[PDB]
Design an enzyme around this catalytic site. Structure first.
Site, mmCIF file in Angstrom:
data_model
loop_
_atom_site.group_PDB
_atom_site.id
_atom_site.type_symbol
_atom_site.label_atom_id
_atom_site.label_comp_id
_atom_site.label_asym_id
_atom_site.label_seq_id
_atom_site.Cartn_x
_atom_site.Cartn_y
_atom_site.Cartn_z
ATOM 1 N N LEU A 46 0.859 -1.213 -0.052
ATOM 2 C CA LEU A 46 0.137 -0.118 0.247
ATOM 3 C C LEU A 46 0.937 1.230 0.061
ATOM 4 C CD1 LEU A 46 -2.735 -0.920 2.352
ATOM 5 C CD2 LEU A 46 -2.549 -1.660 0.135
ATOM 6 N N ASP A 47 0.316 2.435 0.154
ATOM 7 C CA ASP A 47 0.978 3.498 0.243
ATOM 8 C C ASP A 47 0.648 4.588 1.441
ATOM 9 O OD1 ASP A 47 -1.473 4.208 -1.755
ATOM 10 O OD2 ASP A 47 -0.753 6.362 -0.907
ATOM 11 N N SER A 48 1.091 5.630 1.456
ATOM 12 C CA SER A 48 0.868 6.350 2.748
ATOM 13 C C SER A 48 -0.723 6.700 2.941
ATOM 14 C CB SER A 48 1.458 7.889 2.758
ATOM 15 O OG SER A 48 2.589 7.554 1.996
ATOM 16 N N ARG A 55 -8.715 11.407 -3.924
ATOM 17 C CA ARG A 55 -7.126 10.951 -4.217
ATOM 18 C C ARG A 55 -6.629 11.450 -5.345
ATOM 19 N NH1 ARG A 55 -3.239 7.117 -3.463
ATOM 20 N NH2 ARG A 55 -3.790 5.487 -1.755
#
Ligand SMILES: CCCCCCCCCCCCCCCCCC(=O)OC[C@H](COP(=O)([O-])OCC[N+](C)(C)C)OC(=O)CCCCCCCCCCCCCCCCC
Ligand SMILES: CCCCCCCCCCCCCCCCCC(=O)OC[C@H](COP(=O)([O-])OCC[N+](C)(C)C)OC(=O)CCCCCCCCCCCCCCCCC
Ligand SMILES: CCCCCCCCCCCCCCCCCC(=O)OC[C@H](COP(=O)([O-])OCC[N+](C)(C)C)OC(=O)CCCCCCCCCCCCCCCCC
Ligand SMILES: CCCCCCCCCCCCCCCCCC(=O)OC[C@H](COP(=O)(O)OCCN)OC(=O)CCCCCCCCCCCCCCCCC
Ligand SMILES: CCCCCCCCCCCCCCCCCC(=O)OC[C@H](COP(=O)(O)OCCN)OC(=O)CCCCCCCCCCCCCCCCC
Ligand SMILES: CCCCCCCCCCCCO[C@@H]1O[C@H](CO)[C@@H](O[C@H]2O[C@H](CO)[C@@H](O)[C@H](O)[C@H]2O)[C@H](O)[C@H]1O
Ligand SMILES: CCCCCCCCCCCCO[C@@H]1O[C@H](CO)[C@@H](O[C@H]2O[C@H](CO)[C@@H](O)[C@H](O)[C@H]2O)[C@H](O)[C@H]1O
Ligand code: SF4
Ligand code: SF4
Ligand code: SF4
Lengths: 78, 157, 114, 178, 115
Positions: A37-39, C50
């Site tokens: 995953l990412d932040s 996002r």
């Protein structure tokens, strides 16, 4: 404080989170290294925990809960 | 033609006359052009003697007179109040700004003509058009309404 | 290379503010979809948030990050207050825009622009 | 020098007379009656309304209305495509192209005025060195489409041929002020 | 019978105008037309949320004053009594206490609207 009962709910949340491949998810699977995953993915996961366990996890606390286990230790230590 | 077509044609005249004779514009004005609109209502021209009465509610209005410059920030609101007028409804574009952007045509913030936002029945030129020029355009809208043939077209469908 | 900070002394402090703003935008999407009656899902609204954050993922200067957050908080404020209308929120989705093709050949056929 | 609009506060004692006058004013609405008197007096005044379109508002020879392109008394066009009007136009409402005419004359092949850009300022007619472009007296040219207000050279020359008799007379009346 | 007849005709006329007004005109229903009006911008909340009443005390005082006039409306029949002095004292006392009640509420700032 209901230590194993908590773990049942935490892993329920991570399975709903689509970005996590549900087989690879284990209580010690690091979000970045393992699950890949990412932040910002992590921020959504902690927000999901905030919904289930019904309390506010500060930015300073949430920055550390980097795999499913530490979430459990953090929650029990509420 | 037939007597059924003659009767339909006379009914078109009657309903057309009623809408000609009771045009109620929205209380709606954007900039300097609205000042000349006030002067059309003022005693010399007295628009109310033609049957023209401002009403503030779009639900109770027949005509929108776009009297001034239309900015990008204003455009959605103007579209909203146009959509909330019950039909049949008409639009009069008044002045260069509303007609096509005018002095501000090349601005980043201005809609180049309100006919990019709403359909327009009459374009009144001038910056501002005089109260009399606006009155002329209102009387041109009335003659346009006089030409409507909605019942004749319904009959021939 | 000595500059005055705005709010954050380093990119690490700035990243903290970015995450706070992201949380605020994330929580707001369902309330905005409901109150403005937008014809989109909540998931689609959060994917757009996002995508807007990742449009700036390459920024390293803490001052620029500070100003991106300041502007992001303003946009959030006019969304929560419903100062933005539906037209304004739906502008983020470019629903009437035909996107420009990215390959050389498609651009060659269309015209002269790179 | 200054004056007070609402400093009448020289507070004084009240007699029975003034107290009763104040009492009558409050209880019998006397100043409200004066208001009705004023509106009644207007009821019996002749109204200021004119019977448009059979009657018209007064105008002056300087009035800035619909544009036109003029001629010399011979029929030759006055415009010699100098583009001073185009340069000065604060709205960039004028678009001009020119070339040598078949007889070698300096004349336009395009002379457009976007009447929906124009601000009817009259700067073009001030700037013209030959009184070619003028704002005429006509103000009743509202249209049913936007496109009808994008005037080309043929339209503007027809306005000149349509309105020259009045345009000439208005120029004769004002040119000594210019 | 007559009063029933005319009021039904009044009801009948009003309802016919409503039916004509809803079935004669051409319609064109779409969402933006039927959304609530608020000067061209969308409402930020429901119109069904609480709307504060600053004159609420005057309002419930009006309830009591409306029963006071109900006690006064028999006066046209009461002035026919042989017991004129009794009736007059009762009416005078009734009006005076109502005045004293109004005077008290006035001096307590009960007629001032809340801020
Ligand atoms: C219900 C109430 C209706 C009562 C009004 C009806 C008459 C209205 C027309 C009017 O008076 O103005 C005359 C108008 C007056 O002219 P105008 O309105 O066009 O011009 C006004 C402008 N100035 C002042 C400059 C003249 O005459 C016309 O030219 C328009 C014709 C309208 C005809 C109306 C319908 C005719 C009757 C048909 C009945 C149905 C037929 C059934 C078969
Ligand atoms: C106090 C006042 C209360 C009473 C108010 C009464 C006012 C009306 C006065 C009478 C006039 C009524 C005319 C209808 C009103 C207009 C409604 C309307 O515009 O709808 C348009 C509609 C539009 O039709 P359309 O089919 O063209 O539209 C299709 C869809 N759109 C809109 C998208 C294009 O037309 C009609 O439906 C007309 C129906 C009425 C026809 C007239 C009566 C028939 C007469 C036949 C002749 C008989 C001859 C016999 C002898 C020989
Ligand atoms: C309830 C009827 C109220 C009648 C009041 C007077 C109005 C008469 C004219 C409108 C008639 C509407 C109608 O019934 O049309 C048939 C209806 C259609 O109604 P409608 O939707 O077309 O009504 C609009 C009428 N025009 C077209 C004139 C605008 O069709 C049916 O058979 C359904 C039953
Ligand atoms: C023997 C026995 C004798 C016993 C009888 C004695 C009777 C004396 C006569 C008293 C008559 C008074 C009637 C009541 C109206 C009144 O006087 O109230 C005045 C009222 C308030 O006035 P205001 O300036 O606001 O000051 C407040 C404190 N007074 O202000 C008002 O009410 C004015 C409201 C008017 C609003 C405009 C409406 C149109 C008015 C034009 C009407 C034309 C017809
Ligand atoms: C109901 C009517 C109430 C009692 C009416 C009597 C009031 C009156 O007398 O009007 C006085 C008014 C003069 O105004 P003012 O200068 O304030 O008077 C000084 C008094 N010390 O008088 C005037 O204004 C002059 C008359 C002008 C108005 C003429 C129309 C009369 C309106 C009354 C009819 C109402 C309907
Ligand atoms: C036992 C059951 C019997 C079968 C029942 C069938 C019911 C079907 C009803 C169809 C709708 C009729 O109802 C009517 O439709 C018209 C056009 O269709 C619409 O009416 C209005 O809105 C639309 C909006 O675009 C316009 O196109 C139309 O011209 C306008 O009149 C409304 O929706 C309604 O006024
Ligand atoms: C705290 C509240 C205070 C407010 C209330 C005050 C009420 C007091 C009222 C005092 C006034 C009474 O007034 C009184 O009226 C009656 C009639 O009505 C008069 O009565 C007179 O006429 C009547 C007929 O009606 C005869 O039958 C009687 O013999 C004769 O005295 C009295 O002479 C007078 O004194
Ligand atoms: S057209 Fe001229 S008068 Fe009318 S609003 Fe624009 S600038 Fe003002
Ligand atoms: S009147 Fe003014 S704005 Fe119009 S064409 Fe002439 S110079 Fe341009
Ligand atoms: S109209 Fe007059 S100012 Fe304009 S190009 Fe022609 S001669 Fe020159």
């Amino acid at each position: 404080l209901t230590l194993d009962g908590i773990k049942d709910r935490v892993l329920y949340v991570l399975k709903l989170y689509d970005k996590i491949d549900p087989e690879k998810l284990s209580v010690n699977s690091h979000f970045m290294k393992d699950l890949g995953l990412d932040s910002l993915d992590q921020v959504e996961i902690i927000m999901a925990m905030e919904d289930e366990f019904g309390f506010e996890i500060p930015d300073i606390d949430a920055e550390k809960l980097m795999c499913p286990q530490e979430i459990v230790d953090y929650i029990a230590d509420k | 033609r037939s007597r059924a077509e003659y009767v339909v044609t006379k009914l078109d005249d009657l309903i057309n006359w009623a809408r000609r004779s009771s045009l109620w514009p929205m209380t709606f004005g954007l900039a300097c052009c609205a000042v000349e609109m006030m002067h059309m209502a003022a005693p010399r021209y007295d628009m109310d003697r033609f049957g023209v009465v401002f009403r503030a509610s779009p639900r109770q209005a027949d005509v929108m007179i776009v009297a001034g410059t239309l900015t990008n920030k204003m455009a959605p609101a103007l579209r909203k109040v146009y959509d909330q007028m019950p039909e049949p409804r008409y639009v009069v574009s008044m002045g260069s700004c509303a007609n096509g952007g005018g002095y501000y045509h090349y601005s980043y913030s201005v809609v180049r003509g309100c006919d990019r936002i709403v359909p327009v029945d009459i374009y009144v030129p001038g910056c501002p058009p005089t109260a009399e020029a606006l009155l002329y355009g209102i009387l041109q809208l009335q003659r346009k309404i006089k030409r409507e043939q909605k019942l004749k077209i319904w009959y021939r469908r | 290379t000595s500059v005055k900070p705005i709010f954050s002394r380093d990119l690490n402090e700035a990243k903290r503010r970015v995450r706070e703003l992201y949380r605020a935008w994330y929580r707001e999407v369902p309330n905005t979809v409901h109150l403005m009656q937008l014809d989109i899902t909540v998931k689609q609204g959060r994917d757009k948030v996002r995508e807007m954050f990742m449009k700036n993922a390459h920024v390293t200067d803490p001052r620029v990050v500070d100003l991106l957050v300041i502007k992001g908080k303003m946009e959030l404020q006019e969304t929560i207050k419903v100062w933005k209308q539906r037209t304004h929120v739906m502008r983020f989705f470019h629903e009437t825009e035909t996107p420009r093709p990215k390959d050389f050949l498609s651009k060659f056929y269309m015209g002269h622009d790179p | 020098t200054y004056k007070y609009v609402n400093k009448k506060e020289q507070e004084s004692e009240v007699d029975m007379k003034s107290a009763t006058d104040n009492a009558a004013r409050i209880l019998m609405w006397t100043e409200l009656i004066r208001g009705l008197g004023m509106t009644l007096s207007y009821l019996f005044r002749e109204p200021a309304t004119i019977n448009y379109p059979f009657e018209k508002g007064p105008l002056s020879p300087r009035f800035r209305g619909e544009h036109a392109l003029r001629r010399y008394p011979s029929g030759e066009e006055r415009c010699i495509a100098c583009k001073l009007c185009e340069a000065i136009c604060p709205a960039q409402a004028i678009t001009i192209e020119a070339e040598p005419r078949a007889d070698g004359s300096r004349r336009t092949t395009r002379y457009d005025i976007d009447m929906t850009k124009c601000i009817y300022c009259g700067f073009c007619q001030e700037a013209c060195p030959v009184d070619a472009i003028v704002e005429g007296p006509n103000f009743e040219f509202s249209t049913e489409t936007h496109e009808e207000l994008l005037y080309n050279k043929e339209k503007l020359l027809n306005n000149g041929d349509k309105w020259e008799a009045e345009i000439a007379a208005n120029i004769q009346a004002d040119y000594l002020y210019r | 019978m007559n009063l029933y007849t005319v009021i039904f005709i009044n009801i009948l006329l009003s309802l016919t105008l409503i039916l004509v007004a809803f079935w004669l005109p051409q319609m064109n229903l779409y969402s933006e037309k039927a959304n609530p009006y608020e000067c061209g911008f969308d409402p930020t909340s429901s119109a069904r949320l609480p709307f504060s009443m600053k004159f609420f005390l005057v309002a419930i005082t009006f309830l009591l004053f409306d029963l006071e006039i109900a006690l006064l409306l028999p006066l046209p029949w009461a002035i026919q009594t042989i017991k004129t002095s009794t009736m007059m004292i009762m009416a005078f006392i009734l009006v005076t206490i109502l005045s004293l009640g109004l005077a008290y509420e006035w001096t307590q700032k009960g007629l001032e609207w809340t801020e």
